[PDB]
Amino acid sequence: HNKDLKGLYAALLVPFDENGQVNEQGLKQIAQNAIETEELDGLYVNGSSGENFLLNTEQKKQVFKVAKEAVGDKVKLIAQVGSLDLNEAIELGKYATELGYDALSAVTPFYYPFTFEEIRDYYFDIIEATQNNMIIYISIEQFSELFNHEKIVGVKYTAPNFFLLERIRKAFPDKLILSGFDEMLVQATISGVDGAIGSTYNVNGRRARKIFDLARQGQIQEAYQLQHDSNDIIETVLSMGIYPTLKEILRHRGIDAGLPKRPFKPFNEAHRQTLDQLIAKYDL
Amino acid sequence: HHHHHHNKDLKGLYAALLVPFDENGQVNEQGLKQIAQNAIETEELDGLYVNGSSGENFLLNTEQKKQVFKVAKEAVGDKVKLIAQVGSLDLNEAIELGKYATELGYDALSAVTPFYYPFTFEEIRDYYFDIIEATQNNMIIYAISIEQFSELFNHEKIVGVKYTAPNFFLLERIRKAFPDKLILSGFDEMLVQATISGVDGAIGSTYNVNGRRARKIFDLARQGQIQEAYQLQHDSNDIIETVLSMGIYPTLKEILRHRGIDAGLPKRPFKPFNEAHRQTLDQLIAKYDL
Amino acid sequence: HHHNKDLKGLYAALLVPFDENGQVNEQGLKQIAQNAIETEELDGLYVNGSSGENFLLNTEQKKQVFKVAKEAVGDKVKLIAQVGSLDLNEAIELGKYATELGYDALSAVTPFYYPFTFEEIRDYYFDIIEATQNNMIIYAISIEQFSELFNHEKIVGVKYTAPNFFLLERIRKAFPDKLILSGFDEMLVQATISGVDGAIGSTYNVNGRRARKIFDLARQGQIQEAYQLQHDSNDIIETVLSMGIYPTLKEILRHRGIDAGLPKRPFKPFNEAHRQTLDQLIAKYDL
Amino acid sequence: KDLKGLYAALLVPFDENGQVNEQGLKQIAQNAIETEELDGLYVNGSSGENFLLNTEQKKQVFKVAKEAVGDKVKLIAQVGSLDLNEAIELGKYATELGYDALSAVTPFYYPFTFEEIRDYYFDIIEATQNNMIIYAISIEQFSELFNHEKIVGVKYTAPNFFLLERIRKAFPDKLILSGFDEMLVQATISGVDGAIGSTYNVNGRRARKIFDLARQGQIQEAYQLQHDSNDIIETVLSMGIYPTLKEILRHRGIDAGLPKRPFKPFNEAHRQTLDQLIAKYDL
Ligand SMILES: [Cl-]
Ligand SMILES: [Cl-]
Ligand SMILES: [Cl-]
Ligand SMILES: [Cl-]
């Protein structure tokens, strides 16, 4: 039977060597850190946070495989397979489905000015070919046309608009809404999201769980205080270059967090003192 | 000199006061009093926010704005909080309106960010400082970065902010950086998210017709009945969505006509409520008992 | 030829000098208006647009500026009165006034601040026209919408200010007999070859001579020389933008012995920290 | 070669599985040069549906286009990609085929810093040793990029004529090729050394006259051809530019195939309007 997809997920980070090749041992450690240290429900694999759009197809497969290998059978797995290359997307979708990922997701085709019908049929084509459940990333009338499909089970919701989130939550009580803005987890929780996916949950998963639980449980003031504490972290990490900095924090716990893939630059050492201070203040 | 002025706290829910006009764009004073009183008595709101965007303030001449301030003041009792929006691209006008509202006893002034031209931050800062300087009243600014907010809030008479930016990350940063300043959110459709974000209150045009629900959202959310708070936000957003699609100011005033209020017309160039919307409006009023 | 083209030419968007209390300095205003015509050699004045700090003024001040500008120039000089306002009663009042004064046309900024519908924008123009019976220049809305506005016999043209040369070309093709005056001084040469009938600019108060050469040279196919003057004009425009356009333009005018006064607050005065850079600009281009 | 002149942003025909049609592609390449009379081909740009391709299809496009045209034809290889290893692999491959210059889109999607954008360009240059054409960014930053002797110019696509004028006089010895077909005459009088465009695949003769006549001071006749060209560009845009431009080529007996999904094919509800355009302008 299919797992329940509600929960909190680490948007999985990927460690690279000097030549932009995946470091499999570090990747394994990052996946395990998300589940075993940060106590999260699931991995969201090959999203933006994993520098996925910097990868070739064979690299994306290697990440899908290492992540699955790293976690137990009860860990929820969502495979972001979106690409401007629909043939690649279908091939990654099939491969991830065959590995047993619980659901696929796919970024809105981007760069070019695709029409809505082009966007809709890119999702439907991926579904036809893979037969896996799908999570999308649009007017309400358009969401409806997408959500009308039984295999589009939900949306990874990342646009910062709470009026549109509310309208969608209302219109589609039967669909999974997983929010993607860590810095607004508490507002997303009270807006009825079914969970969230975040890159900072790799280092701040415990506080994230409390915000989500406390807010649902009606303890708003304490959830909001933890949102304050979390946003210090998020703001700091953002100002230092978010991917390298998150991986520098993980490096600090003994994980082989490697480098970002160029053209991303590595963590700038002039930020080291400010980062050490953050780690100490929030015991990261 | 010797009079004991009631120094009101400015927390709570405020109607952004709507204004009824005749065919020549003149203020219908008697409809205004009705609208002001609906807000306080029927809608059970804490205060009136006067001569904001909602009151078609930027369509008015200086005399009409003074007129609006006087009539809203007349129409309510001494327990009602009053904030006077006095912002204008004409700073002399803003100072004039600021003095006149303060003399009437308005509890605070507010002023929109100077607009149209690309003013620098130094110019926006000094607009606010010049109005405060000439009126000596407390001032609520509009939303500018956190560092600039810090310079602004370092003025003792800038007591708070009418926050309309749809950004809950910046709202949270502001709430944390300035725990002792007043924050009133201006997005009716996100009142529940503002509340759990620690706003002190809210100003809205739809509170003229949905203030009872608005209060329930505000209270239930703070009491941690968040599920019930949100369900009332769903309902409210049904309303707000509908009225936005028909033209917010005329439609809101058409909802007040139905209560027997003399809601008149919007000022041109605003067009009247289009009768082609009449049947959907009637249906919305019916389902939500407005 | 069409009578819609009567108002072709090059216009100073008239600057206004104020005292410390935001009051109009009438004599310096006269000097600015005369400088535009006599020194800069322009065809006309565009009076009470944004450049004149119009939206900072009360109704009486806008009338004052309309009156003095008109008094300062001869009957040969072309006059356009920007009367647009969020207050349509004010707009109509200013319109009648400017018309009775003998202004050749009215113009009006697109209703702003609120999200007005197109139908609301259109009837704002239509109400001004009906109440004033003057010719009207609109501001830049799709071509289908332009087609609707330009069907009014009293809407003679557009003061075109969108940075978009595809839309302009489309407009110029679709309305060969309407007036098009461009409002971007830094793209005058591009507007010219795109068939504009003229231009309205704040920088022509200090650089109207180069501007006329750009316009004439480019219409004459002397594109290289015309472009070289745009390079010149763009050093000037870019420099002045970096220092605060209205106070800086007025400072250049003070350098010529004109009583240029101050910007109206909340605009701040020329910041002395730009003094050396400005002087360097004035000497380089002989301004 | 001197890089001045007019280039077709090369279109690519696909079959229903999104595989390159090599014969139609050779035909498209040759139409640009022989029929449209252009100086060169801009290869694997956005117009070629490049960003929908895998690495092997991109190589395939570079090879076919180069083998399709004479030695005297100017060739620029767009190799930009979010995958820098891929960009560098493509840059080496296109360089070894003999492309006269590389170009690379600005790294996109993620909020890259300027330092990241800069060194992406410099890393590609370092590894390929070919000349590079950047995409467009402040003047102080252009200066940092153009300080590099191998960064020989910019494909300028943002229709801001203030910034373009600023760049032209700041960098009078660098190459500037504009990317907006609908504003070619404004670009020409602003001193561009040439242009790259998708619509030049069907309308390259008018475009040459616009370029030439405008520089000859025959400004009104240049502008008239721009009116005519903008009727075409407008129409083509309203129907879906790439499938429509390819449909125009198909009218000429070329095997113009299909767009790669998720682009959809030409919608036949547009056929009559397209027929009338082709008749009106002899396309
Ligand atoms: Cl992600
Ligand atoms: Cl308001
Ligand atoms: Cl102006
Ligand atoms: Cl291209």
Side-chain angles (χ1 to χ4, degrees), chain A residues 1 3-17 19-73 75-97 99-127 129-137 139 141-220 222-284, chain B residues 2-4 6-22 24-32 34-78 80-102 104-143 145-155 157-227 229-256 258-278 280-286 288-290, chain C residues 1-2 4-19 21-75 77-99 101-142 144-152 154-222 226-253 255-287, chain D residues 1-22 24-25 27-33 35-71 73-95 97-136 138-139 141-220 222-283:
Chain A
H1 74 296
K3 300 189 183 68
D4 186 353
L5 291 178
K6 290 148 171 130
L8 308 180
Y9 295 74
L12 184 72
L13 297 161
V14 184
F16 299 92
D17 72 11
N19 301 313
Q21 302 309 304
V22 172
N23 172 349
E24 301 199 335
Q25 8 294 142
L27 186 53
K28 184 166 157 142
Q29 294 173 331
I30 298 187
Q32 308 194 314
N33 168 87
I35 303 310
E36 299 163 20
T37 308
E38 302 292 327
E39 304 182 330
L40 292 157
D41 303 312
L43 299 194
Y44 185 79
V45 182
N46 281 323
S48 297
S49 305
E51 305 175 47
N52 168 262
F53 301 101
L54 277 65
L55 306 172
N56 63 44
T57 301
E58 291 67 38
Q59 294 175 303
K60 303 173 184 186
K61 285 174 165 177
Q62 141 188 55
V63 174
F64 276 135
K65 166 180 131 88
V66 170
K68 170 79 199 176
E69 230 132 275
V71 298
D73 274 359
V75 170
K76 298 136 146 67
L77 292 175
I78 295 181
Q80 195 300 136
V81 297
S83 172
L84 290 195
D85 179 356
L86 181 58
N87 289 329
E88 183 191 23
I90 284 164
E91 159 171 2
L92 293 168
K94 290 172 182 304
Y95 178 89
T97 303
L99 286 172
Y101 278 75
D102 302 296
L104 298 175
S105 74
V107 294
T108 310
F110 56 94
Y111 199 67
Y112 294 104
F114 293 104
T115 70
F116 170 68
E117 12 295 289
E118 287 166 343
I119 289 159
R120 180 199 63 221
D121 295 346
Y122 156 102
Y123 286 112
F124 290 11
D125 288 350
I126 296 154
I127 294 159
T130 59
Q131 288 302 329
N132 207 335
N133 284 326
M134 165 72 66
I135 291 159
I136 59 162
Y137 266 67
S139 83
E141 293 79 354
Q142 282 159 356
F143 273 108
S144 301
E145 216 186 325
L146 292 162
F147 282 141
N148 202 36
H149 197 312
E150 278 271 287
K151 305 233 173 213
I152 299 194
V153 301
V155 59
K156 165 139 173 271
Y157 189 81
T158 59
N161 178 347
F162 286 85
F163 182 21
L164 180 52
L165 173 62
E166 174 280 325
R167 292 288 81 176
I168 289 166
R169 167 77 298 166
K170 157 85 135 54
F172 307 105
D174 55 304
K175 300 290 170 158
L176 186 100
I177 308 189
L178 310 167
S179 55
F181 32 69
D182 305 11
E183 64 286 359
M184 294 172 279
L185 182 57
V186 73
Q187 298 84 359
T189 310
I190 74 93
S191 293
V193 304
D194 296 291
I197 292 151
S199 55
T200 76
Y201 307 152
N202 287 279
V203 304
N204 193 43
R206 260 87 37 102
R207 275 186 200 83
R209 195 170 289 297
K210 289 162 163 184
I211 294 164
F212 186 66
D213 294 345
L214 293 167
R216 281 180 314 143
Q217 285 180 311
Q219 293 173 278
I220 193 57
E222 193 192 352
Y224 189 47
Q225 178 55 57
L226 290 164
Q227 190 70 67
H228 287 321
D229 299 349
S230 297
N231 291 5
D232 285 346
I233 295 157
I234 296 161
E235 186 177 45
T236 306
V237 138
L238 274 176
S239 77
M240 296 174 178
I242 182 165
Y243 306 152
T245 301
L246 288 175
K247 282 136 79 177
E248 281 308 287
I249 298 166
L250 291 169
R251 195 182 139 247
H252 161 93
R253 316 167 177 194
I255 301 156
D256 187 6
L259 304 161
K261 189 164 196 283
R262 285 172 291 121
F264 280 127
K265 283 176 184 297
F267 177 75
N268 193 129
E269 289 296 327
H271 299 305
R272 182 67 64 188
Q273 158 158 48
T274 300
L275 182 69
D276 287 340
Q277 288 171 11
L278 191 70
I279 287 166
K281 191 175 175 200
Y282 287 107
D283 182 33
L284 303 171
Chain B
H2 298 312
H3 299 254
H4 176 211
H6 185 207
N7 196 28
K8 304 201 182 84
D9 74 299
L10 298 170
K11 299 175 200 171
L13 301 169
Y14 292 74
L17 187 69
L18 305 158
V19 185
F21 298 91
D22 72 22
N24 300 341
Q26 298 311 296
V27 175
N28 176 347
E29 295 200 354
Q30 180 51 50
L32 187 51
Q34 285 160 37
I35 294 166
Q37 295 172 347
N38 168 262
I40 298 317
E41 286 141 17
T42 307
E43 298 306 322
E44 303 189 327
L45 294 166
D46 296 297
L48 302 186
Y49 186 76
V50 188
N51 278 333
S53 292
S54 301
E56 305 176 52
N57 169 260
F58 305 95
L59 282 72
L60 304 182
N61 70 45
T62 298
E63 305 323 306
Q64 296 181 299
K65 297 168 188 186
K66 283 181 187 178
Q67 178 176 20
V68 175
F69 285 141
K70 207 192 189 190
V71 173
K73 165 68 177 199
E74 253 58 312
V76 287
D78 279 34
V80 179
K81 291 127 152 77
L82 294 165
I83 300 167
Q85 197 294 134
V86 297
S88 171
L89 302 188
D90 185 345
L91 175 62
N92 290 332
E93 194 195 14
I95 288 159
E96 196 181 334
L97 292 166
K99 292 174 185 260
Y100 178 92
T102 302
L104 290 181
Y106 276 78
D107 300 294
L109 305 178
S110 72
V112 290
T113 303
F115 52 90
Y116 199 69
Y117 297 99
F119 294 107
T120 65
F121 169 73
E122 145 179 77
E123 294 168 338
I124 297 176
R125 182 199 65 209
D126 291 352
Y127 163 95
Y128 286 110
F129 290 13
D130 289 357
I131 301 162
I132 296 154
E133 146 119 299
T135 61
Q136 293 318 317
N137 208 344
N138 290 334
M139 164 77 71
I140 298 180
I141 62 182
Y142 271 57
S145 63
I146 279 287
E147 262 154 277
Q148 291 173 335
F149 276 112
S150 302
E151 195 179 355
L152 291 176
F153 285 138
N154 176 75
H155 193 306
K157 303 262 203 227
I158 299 189
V159 294
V161 58
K162 185 184 162 196
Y163 192 81
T164 70
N167 183 334
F168 287 85
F169 184 25
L170 172 59
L171 179 57
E172 174 274 331
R173 292 288 83 186
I174 286 161
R175 171 78 287 171
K176 144 92 154 293
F178 305 105
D180 295 328
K181 298 281 174 173
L182 191 93
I183 303 167
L184 314 168
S185 52
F187 30 77
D188 309 10
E189 71 276 13
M190 300 166 269
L191 173 63
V192 70
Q193 296 89 353
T195 303
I196 59 109
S197 291
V199 298
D200 300 289
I203 293 163
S205 56
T206 72
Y207 301 154
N208 283 284
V209 311
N210 193 49
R212 231 113 26 73
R213 270 180 201 85
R215 203 170 294 272
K216 279 291 155 160
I217 295 148
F218 192 56
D219 287 345
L220 288 166
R222 274 174 331 155
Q223 292 159 3
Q225 279 128 291
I226 202 61
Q227 248 96 318
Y230 192 39
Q231 174 56 52
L232 292 177
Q233 188 75 67
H234 283 326
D235 295 359
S236 292
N237 290 2
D238 279 351
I239 295 167
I240 293 151
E241 180 165 53
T242 303
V243 179
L244 285 164
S245 68
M246 305 166 178
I248 187 139
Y249 309 141
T251 298
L252 290 170
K253 292 186 277 173
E254 281 300 291
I255 294 168
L256 305 188
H258 137 90
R259 295 172 181 191
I261 295 181
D262 199 6
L265 301 162
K267 198 165 182 294
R268 285 182 281 119
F270 283 127
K271 284 199 186 282
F273 177 77
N274 194 102
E275 283 317 320
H277 292 305
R278 173 56 58 183
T280 303
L281 182 59
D282 289 334
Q283 288 155 37
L284 168 84
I285 295 175
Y288 287 106
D289 187 14
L290 314 161
Chain C
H1 177 70
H2 200 284
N4 287 341
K5 260 67 155 274
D6 286 356
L7 303 182
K8 49 175 169 283
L10 290 168
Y11 293 76
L14 182 66
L15 302 163
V16 182
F18 304 87
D19 61 32
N21 312 308
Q23 304 303 298
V24 180
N25 176 346
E26 293 200 350
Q27 34 285 150
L29 181 53
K30 185 172 209 226
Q31 298 180 322
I32 296 188
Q34 291 187 340
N35 171 263
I37 307 309
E38 304 175 37
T39 308
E40 299 307 328
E41 294 170 335
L42 298 155
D43 304 310
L45 308 184
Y46 188 78
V47 183
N48 276 334
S50 311
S51 291
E53 296 163 70
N54 175 259
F55 302 99
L56 277 56
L57 310 176
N58 65 51
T59 316
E60 298 59 39
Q61 292 181 302
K62 299 167 179 187
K63 288 167 169 188
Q64 209 177 348
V65 172
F66 276 147
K67 183 167 84 109
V68 180
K70 166 93 191 204
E71 274 155 23
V73 299
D75 280 323
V77 176
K78 282 160 189 186
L79 298 172
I80 309 168
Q82 198 289 141
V83 301
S85 177
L86 290 189
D87 185 359
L88 173 61
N89 287 334
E90 181 182 25
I92 286 168
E93 191 187 347
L94 289 171
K96 288 177 185 296
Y97 182 78
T99 298
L101 256 183
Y103 273 82
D104 304 287
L106 302 197
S107 69
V109 292
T110 297
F112 55 91
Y113 194 71
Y114 302 100
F116 294 107
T117 67
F118 167 69
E119 153 196 67
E120 282 164 343
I121 292 164
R122 171 200 75 209
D123 294 350
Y124 158 90
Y125 285 115
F126 286 15
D127 289 347
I128 300 169
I129 294 169
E130 178 184 55
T132 63
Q133 301 297 323
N134 211 342
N135 292 327
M136 167 65 71
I137 291 169
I138 61 179
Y139 272 62
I141 297 147
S142 62
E144 297 83 335
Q145 280 166 347
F146 276 117
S147 293
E148 180 163 1
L149 298 167
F150 283 147
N151 188 61
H152 201 300
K154 294 220 125 89
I155 291 174
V156 308
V158 49
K159 181 193 168 196
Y160 185 86
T161 210
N164 184 338
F165 286 90
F166 172 64
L167 177 58
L168 180 60
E169 173 275 326
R170 289 289 87 179
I171 281 164
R172 170 81 293 172
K173 158 86 135 36
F175 306 109
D177 296 294
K178 297 281 168 179
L179 188 72
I180 302 165
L181 300 180
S182 56
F184 29 75
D185 307 12
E186 66 274 23
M187 303 172 302
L188 173 59
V189 71
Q190 295 86 176
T192 300
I193 67 96
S194 300
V196 305
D197 305 292
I200 295 160
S202 69
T203 72
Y204 309 153
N205 285 280
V206 311
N207 192 51
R209 197 109 28 77
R210 289 193 182 79
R212 188 178 299 289
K213 279 175 180 74
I214 293 166
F215 188 70
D216 296 332
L217 293 183
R219 301 228 283 186
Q220 276 155 10
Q222 289 280 102
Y227 191 39
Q228 206 47 42
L229 296 163
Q230 186 77 58
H231 283 324
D232 288 354
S233 301
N234 288 6
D235 289 355
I236 297 165
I237 292 158
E238 176 175 48
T239 297
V240 165
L241 284 170
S242 71
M243 294 173 183
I245 184 161
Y246 308 145
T248 303
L249 285 173
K250 279 138 133 193
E251 282 301 286
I252 295 162
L253 296 177
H255 145 100
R256 308 178 178 188
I258 282 164
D259 185 7
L262 300 171
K264 184 163 191 301
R265 283 180 271 111
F267 279 125
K268 279 185 183 289
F270 177 76
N271 195 115
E272 285 303 309
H274 295 127
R275 182 55 54 174
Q276 280 79 53
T277 304
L278 179 54
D279 288 343
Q280 288 162 3
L281 182 75
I282 291 168
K284 178 184 195 167
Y285 289 104
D286 180 30
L287 298 175
Chain D
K1 310 195 185 74
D2 172 31
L3 293 181
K4 294 175 200 194
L6 294 183
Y7 295 75
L10 188 65
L11 300 156
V12 184
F14 299 90
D15 65 27
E16 25 136 39
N17 295 313
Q19 300 312 304
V20 177
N21 179 335
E22 285 192 355
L25 178 59
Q27 288 183 330
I28 292 179
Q30 288 178 341
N31 170 266
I33 299 314
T35 306
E36 301 300 324
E37 295 171 1
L38 301 164
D39 303 300
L41 306 174
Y42 190 75
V43 183
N44 281 324
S46 299
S47 296
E49 303 169 59
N50 173 253
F51 303 96
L52 287 58
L53 305 175
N54 63 45
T55 299
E56 250 70 61
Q57 296 178 303
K58 292 167 175 186
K59 296 196 180 179
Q60 170 175 28
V61 173
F62 284 136
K63 185 164 147 55
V64 173
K66 164 76 196 175
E67 286 168 13
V69 298
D71 268 311
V73 173
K74 286 128 144 59
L75 296 172
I76 297 169
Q78 201 290 142
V79 300
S81 164
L82 296 181
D83 179 356
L84 173 69
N85 288 328
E86 182 187 27
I88 279 157
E89 185 188 344
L90 293 171
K92 289 198 210 290
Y93 184 83
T95 299
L97 289 174
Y99 276 72
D100 301 285
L102 308 176
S103 78
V105 294
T106 319
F108 55 97
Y109 183 88
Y110 296 99
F112 300 101
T113 71
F114 169 82
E115 296 60 25
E116 294 172 332
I117 297 172
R118 179 193 74 222
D119 288 352
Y120 157 94
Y121 287 113
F122 295 7
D123 292 352
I124 300 171
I125 292 150
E126 171 49 32
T128 68
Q129 297 300 322
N130 203 341
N131 290 325
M132 169 65 64
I133 290 172
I134 59 168
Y135 273 60
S138 76
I139 284 275
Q141 287 162 346
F142 281 113
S143 313
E144 235 186 300
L145 288 159
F146 279 148
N147 207 51
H148 200 309
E149 58 150 31
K150 302 267 187 214
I151 292 179
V152 297
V154 53
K155 176 180 186 215
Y156 190 77
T157 48
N160 175 352
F161 290 86
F162 192 8
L163 173 60
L164 175 54
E165 177 276 328
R166 290 288 89 178
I167 298 177
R168 165 80 295 165
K169 84 118 190 198
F171 307 99
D173 299 323
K174 299 273 176 188
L175 191 88
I176 301 177
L177 298 177
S178 52
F180 28 80
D181 307 12
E182 70 277 9
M183 295 167 286
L184 174 59
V185 68
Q186 295 86 6
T188 302
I189 69 87
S190 313
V192 303
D193 304 294
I196 295 161
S198 61
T199 78
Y200 310 150
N201 289 280
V202 307
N203 189 54
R205 271 167 315 105
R206 284 186 190 81
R208 182 167 301 298
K209 277 175 177 158
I210 298 174
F211 197 57
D212 293 337
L213 290 171
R215 282 175 323 147
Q216 284 153 9
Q218 293 302 290
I219 192 66
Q220 287 180 24
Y223 191 42
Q224 178 55 54
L225 294 171
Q226 192 75 67
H227 283 316
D228 300 340
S229 295
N230 288 5
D231 277 5
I232 296 166
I233 296 151
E234 188 171 43
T235 299
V236 144
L237 281 173
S238 79
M239 298 171 179
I241 189 148
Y242 311 143
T244 305
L245 289 171
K246 285 183 284 166
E247 277 307 293
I248 290 159
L249 297 177
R250 219 194 105 249
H251 162 95
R252 305 172 183 192
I254 292 159
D255 199 6
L258 299 174
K260 196 168 182 297
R261 279 175 294 115
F263 290 121
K264 273 181 194 306
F266 184 70
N267 184 148
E268 288 303 323
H270 294 313
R271 184 60 71 188
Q272 189 187 23
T273 299
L274 182 64
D275 281 337
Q276 293 165 356
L277 187 75
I278 291 168
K280 178 166 179 214
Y281 288 110
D282 188 18
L283 302 182

